[PDB]
């Protein structure tokens, strides 16, 4: 949907200086470190065999309930749902060469945004955060 609801500007030919930076690959509505995400996933899908109720999960308690509301009667294998939740929560950050656009919405199109000798104007769809602006 983000790709489809996108506008493409002009393409310019000229030098492009790209710097290798650690950037987020895909946008996430909610982002937490892998340990916190794993704890939240265990609470959502396997509450019985979850272990110590770590205090770090407190902030996400409400969220857990929401997820337990959506997956109350799902006949999908629990591991696939767990990895769906990891995709939606766990962040993938990689060192990539970027030039003037590091937001995750732009990293998805990075292959099309620019090379070493050309720039492509791209307007991703959806909504953007105030912090990025």
Partner 1 sequence: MDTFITRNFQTTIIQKAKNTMAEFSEDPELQPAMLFNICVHLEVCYVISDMNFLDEEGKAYTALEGQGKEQNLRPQYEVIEGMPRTIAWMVQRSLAQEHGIETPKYLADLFDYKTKRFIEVGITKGLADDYFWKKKEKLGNSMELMIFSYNQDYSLSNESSLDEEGKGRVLSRLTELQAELSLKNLWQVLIGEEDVEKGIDFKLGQTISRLRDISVPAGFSNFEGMRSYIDNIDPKG
Partner 2 sequence: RKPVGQHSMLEAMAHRLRMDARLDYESGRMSKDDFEKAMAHLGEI
Which residues contribute to the site for RNA (CB under 7 A)? 21-25, 31, 33-35, 79-80, 83, 91-95
Residue 56, helix vs strand vs coil: helix
The least distance separating partner 1 from the CB of residue 55, rounded to whole angstroms, comes to 8
The least distance separating partner 1 from the CB of residue 89, rounded to whole angstroms, comes to 21
In the DSSP assignment, the letter for residue 125 is S
| Cα of 128 vs its chain's centroid, Å | 13
Treating both helix axes as pointing N-terminal to C-terminal, what angle do 61-70 and 34-45 enclose, rounded to 10 degrees? 50
The least distance separating partner 2 from the CB of residue 59, rounded to whole angstroms, comes to 21
Cβ distance to partner 2 smaller for residue 1 or 79: 79
Contact at 8 Å (CB) between 89 and 41? yes
Q: Which stretch binds partner 2 (CB under 8 A): 17-25, 38-46, 62-70, 90-98?
A: 38-46
Residue 38 contacts partner 2 per CB under 8 A = yes
- Residues in contact with partner 1 by the rule CB under 8 A: 47-53, 55
Contact at 8 Å (CB) between 7 and 110? no
């Amino acid at each position: 949907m983000r790709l489809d609801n996108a506008t493409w500007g002009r393409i310019t030919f000229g030098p492009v200086e790209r710097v290798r930076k650690r950037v987020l690959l895909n946008p996430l509505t909610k982002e937490m470190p892998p340990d916190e995400a794993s704890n939240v996933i265990m609470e959502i899908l396997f509450p019985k065999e979850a272990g110590i109720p770590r205090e770090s999960t407190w902030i996400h308690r409400e969220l857990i309930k929401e997820k337990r509301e959506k997956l109350k009667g799902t006949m999908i294998t629990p591991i696939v749902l767990a990895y769906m939740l990891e995709r939606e929560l766990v962040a993938r950050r990689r060192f990539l060469p970027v030039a003037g656009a590091t937001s995750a919405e732009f990293i998805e199109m990075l292959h099309c945004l620019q090379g070493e000798n050309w720039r492509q104007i791209y307007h991703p769809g959806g909504n953007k955060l105030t912090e990025s602006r």
